[PDB]
């Protein structure tokens, strides 16, 4: 039995500069062709989702999954994400203690682009500052500051079990602008391993 | 001034005469250490019966006796003998290998002919005069 | 007094430090490539100006960090502990190289400088002693030579064999405390200030910045001592093995200061010479050696 | 043959761990250049030597099948040549054993 | 039979704080079944215990007994874990702070004779224990010299307190 299915049934195309942006709510209505009539589906089974109130329930959902993650609340937080999301969330940070906090969104969140035996996905927008720092098991900071803000945006996918009397939102995947920039990298210093050969072989 | 080698004295030089057909027909043979050493000088002294010439019937007998197959014969009077004419001696290359992995620990060396057509074993190198101690030392050679 | 200026010129070199540590901001992440012979290929991500060639070394194996005494960074000699500046192909350098004439001048550079610092600590502080320049010699010379300016008072002095012997064990305690090289390129404003006394000192800034575009002029310190250098220098002094102070040639213009050049032989630790081969050395090092 | 009581694990103990029992550590490792493995000053490399011996045996693979037969030892000079290289007049009057593999940058 | 070496290997530290020095790294690695004598192996533990990641290694490249073999694939192990998992960021930069063998599971098997006799036929089976914490060896022991022998018997006697007096 699955209650989520994997992948995006179309991913949405951010255009370079949403950052810096009315204008992009507009943007919907123009694409609300393409999204309006996937919109009405999620509307014929539940009737009150709407892309203007929808980002402050998915909001608040994403914010309490990585709440979890601080308290490892592995129960809490199989209710606030879909099956595929759990693993993603927290199978890197095995054997590490991670202080996660969220600063005030820099940007309202806002629905981008929603699709649809009938299970629908919907894309939000996401920038919002966050404070990270994860330590080794020994203690040792590995990744990030302790109370310094990054500011990310982000498009995140929930997704909802329309056909379920009781299906409800759960978040499912993100996606990654391209034009959005690397992550911080790691504290630590990686190597990029040479070439391994036979004695008789000869380097390449 | 022999190793105690063989159930009898016989089988040392049997198993000398199977040492040595061996490393004539191939030029390079891998044994133990104790081994190599020890045929090391027969196969010095073999070379010297190639050099005293084909028509000497005293080098045939030892030839004949110690070399199992016949086919060698005119190779050591024509490829052997010709080849260590120029020099004088220490036709045998000696070398240790890493002991055998078999369990026993055997102590294990290569034994070639010189001059082979076989690919250069990895010798020692002394170190180059351009180090440091050398060139301090090439000074003091200049002054003196 | 000597270790007033001690003193002061440690805190200009650690300043020193901390302004170029201030002036780098964050971590950033350059990709070296070992071009070296052995493990050829490897590609280590480094932060810029704060990793050094000992870090890959210890990256590897401790093998590189006690066989490698400098580094080829893009083909150039780069100094153990000096910090990598950006990705680049990386090498050591040991001892036992093909072509260690590099490494020969680094290892006599930093004999001689060892040096230096002894003379200045031997004398007592009532008496006046100027380093004026440390001679580059060539190795086949057989012994690495150190200037120095002394006193009026010392011109008539001259060390005996228990004196040339204090010298030593100076030298040896170098060697024995394993002070590290620190080195820094600094301008030569400041440089002139930290030897701004030593007005010998003060002209061999001169002449180093004046070979270069900028005034940057190549600064390598020694516990508290420091000293100007023609080029790369060990890594540590306990890199020698054998040290001696062979002898002492007074210069013959000795009119305004006695300038006396100073014979020594050292070892490092990788070659090791036999106790007669020292001998003849240490007796093949105590002639006059002139720069040609 | 047995002690007349049984031998005390005190007593044991210090036995076994007498230093002359221990294992000693050896000094002599080095490194191999041309393998950059490690080696004992006195023996020689095998991870370079290994390469030896490989061709040696392909060498000799070829010369078995040039020769065709049992007891067929030449009386006359061997030379191996490699994909490149081909037989010259002072390669005349010698074996010449042909490798498809090109002549190795260690073999010379 | 007991697995709690590993249990430590899964030990988690608290977060350190900021004003909290980088803890040394510890890693707990152990071959629980090794068809050989635990003495054997302690000789070979006790050898090593105290020594760097690459000295061990290289010592146990020329050992001819099959246990070191087995130790340095053990080794070799415990130093792959420990970069990948224990954020060991030089390769170099370990030593063997513990060493030890112990006991494992036999089989139990009567030895036949030829001539109606009959023996006890043991197959042996140890266990090896390794902690490896990250960092150069700790420097070697100093032996004491005369003059701190001398001053130790002087504070002795002054030491000394009188018995059964006011
Ligand atoms: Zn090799």
Redesign the interface.
């Known amino acids: 039995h699955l209650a989520c299915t994997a992948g995006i049934f179309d991913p949405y195309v951010p255009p370079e500069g949403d950052a810096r942006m009315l204008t992009q709510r507009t943007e919907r209505l123009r694409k609300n062709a393409a999204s309006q009539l996937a919109i009405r589906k999620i509307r014929e089974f539940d009737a009150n989702f709407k892309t203007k109130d929808f980002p402050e329930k998915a909001k608040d959902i994403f914010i309490e999954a990585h709440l979890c993650l601080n308290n490892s609340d592995h129960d809490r937080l199989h209710t606030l994400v879909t099956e595929h999301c759990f693993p993603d969330m927290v199978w890197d940070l095995k054997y590490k203690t991670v202080r996660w906090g969220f600063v005030e969104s820099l940007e309202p969140a806002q629905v981008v682009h929603v699709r649809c035996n009938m299970y629908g996905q919907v894309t939000v927008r996401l920038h919002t500052r966050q404070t990270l720092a994860i330590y080794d098991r020994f203690g040792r900071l590995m990744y990030g500051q302790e109370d310094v803000p990054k500011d990310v945006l982000e498009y995140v996918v929930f997704e909802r079990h329309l056909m379920n009397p009781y299906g409800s939102w759960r978040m499912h995947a993100k996606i990654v602008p391209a034009w959005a920039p690397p992550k911080q990298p790691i504290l630590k210093t990686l190597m990029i391993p040479g070439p391994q050969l036979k004695p008789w072989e000869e380097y390449e | 001034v022999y190793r105690r080698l063989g159930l009898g004295p016989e089988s040392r030089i049997h198993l000398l005469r199977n040492l040595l057909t061996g490393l004539v027909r191939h030029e390079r043979i891998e044994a133990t250490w104790a081994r190599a050493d020890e045929m090391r000088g027969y196969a010095e002294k073999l070379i010297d019966y190639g050099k005293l010439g084909d028509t000497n019937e005293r080098a045939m007998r030892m030839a004949d006796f110690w070399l199992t197959e016949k086919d060698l014969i005119p190779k050591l009077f024509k490829v052997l003998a010709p080849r260590f004419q120029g020099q004088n001696g220490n036709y045998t290359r000696m070398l240790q290998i890493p002991n055998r992995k078999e369990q026993d620990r055997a102590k294990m060396a290569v034994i070639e002919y010189k001059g082979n057509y076989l690919p250069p074993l990895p010798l020692p190198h002394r170190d180059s005069n351009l180090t440091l101690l050398n060139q301090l030392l090439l000074g003091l050679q200049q002054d003196l | 007094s000597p270790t007033e200026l001690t003193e002061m010129r440690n805190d200009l070199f650690n300043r020193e430090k901390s302004r170029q540590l201030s002036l780098t901001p964050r971590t950033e992440k350059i990709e070296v490539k070992h071009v070296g012979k052995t493990d050829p290929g490897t590609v280590f991500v480094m932060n810029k100006n704060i990793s050094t060639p000992y870090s890959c070394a210890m990256h590897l194996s401790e093998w590189y960090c006690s066989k490698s005494i400098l580094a080829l960074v893009d083909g150039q000699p780069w100094d153990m502990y000096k910090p990598l500046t950006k990705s680049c192909e990386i090498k050591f350098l040991t001892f036992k190289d093909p072509d260690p004439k590099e490494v020969n001048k680094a290892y006599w550079r930093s004999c001689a400088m060892m040096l230096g610092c002894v003379i200045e600590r031997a004398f007592k502080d009532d008496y006046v002693v100027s380093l004026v320049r440390a001679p580059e010699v060539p190795v086949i010379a057989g012994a690495f030579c150190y200037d120095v300016t002394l006193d009026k008072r010392l011109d008539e002095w001259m060390p005996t064999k228990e004196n040339l012997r204090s010298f030593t064990k100076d030298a040896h305690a170098l060697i024995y405390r394993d002070l590290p090289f620190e080195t820094l390129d600094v301008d030569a404003r400041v440089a002139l200030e930290i030897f701004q006394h030593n007005k010998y000192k003060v002209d061999f800034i001169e002449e180093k910045a004046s070979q270069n575009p900028e005034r940057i002029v190549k600064l390598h310190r020694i516990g508290d001592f420091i000293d100007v250098s023609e080029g790369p220098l060990i890594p540590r002094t306990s890199v020698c093995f054998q040290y001696e102070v062979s002898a002492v040639h007074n210069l013959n213009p000795s009119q305004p200061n006695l300038i006396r050049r100073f014979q020594g032989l050292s070892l490092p630790t990788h070659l090791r010479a036999q106790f007669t081969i020292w001998d003849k050395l240490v007796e093949r090092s105590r002639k006059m050696v002139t720069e040609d | 043959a047995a002690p007349k009581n049984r031998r005390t694990i005190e007593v044991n103990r210090c036995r ?2 007498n230093p002359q ?6 000094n002599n ?1 080095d ?1 191999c ?4 493995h ?1 080696k ?1 000053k ?15 045996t392909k ?2 693979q070829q010369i078995g099948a040039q020769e065709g037969g049992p ?10 040549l490699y994909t490149g290289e081909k037989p010259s007049e002072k390669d005349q009057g010698k074996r010449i ?1 042909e490798r498809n593999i090109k002549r ?5 | 039979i007991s697995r709690k070496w590993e249990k430590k290997n899964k030990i988690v530290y608290p977060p350190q704080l900021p004003g909290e020095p980088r803890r040394p790294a510890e890693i707990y690695h152990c071959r629980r079944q090794i068809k050989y004598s635990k003495d054997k192996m302690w000789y070979l533990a006790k050898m090593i215990r105290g020594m760097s990641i690459d000295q061990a290694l290289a010592q146990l490249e020329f050992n001819d007994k099959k246990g070191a073999q087995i130790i340095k694939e053990v080794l070799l192990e415990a130093q792959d874990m420990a970069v990948r998992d224990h954020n060991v960021e030089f390769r170099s930069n370990l030593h063997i702070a513990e060493s030890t063998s112990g006991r494992g599971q036999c089989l139990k098997r009567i030895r036949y004779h030829g001539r109606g006799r009959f023996g006890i036929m043991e197959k042996v089976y140890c266990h090896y224990f390794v902690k490896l914490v990250e960092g150069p060896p700790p420097p070697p022991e100093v032996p004491k010299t005369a003059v701190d022998h001398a001053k130790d018997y002087i504070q002795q006697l002054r030491s000394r307190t009188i018995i059964h007096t006011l």
């Open positions: 076994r761990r029992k221990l294992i000693k550590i050896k490792i490194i250049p041309e393998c950059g490690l004992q006195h023996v020689l490399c095998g991870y370079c030597y290994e390469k030896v011996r490989q061709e040696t060498i000799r007891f067929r030892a030449p009386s006359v000079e061997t030379m191996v054993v190795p940058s260690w073999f010379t």
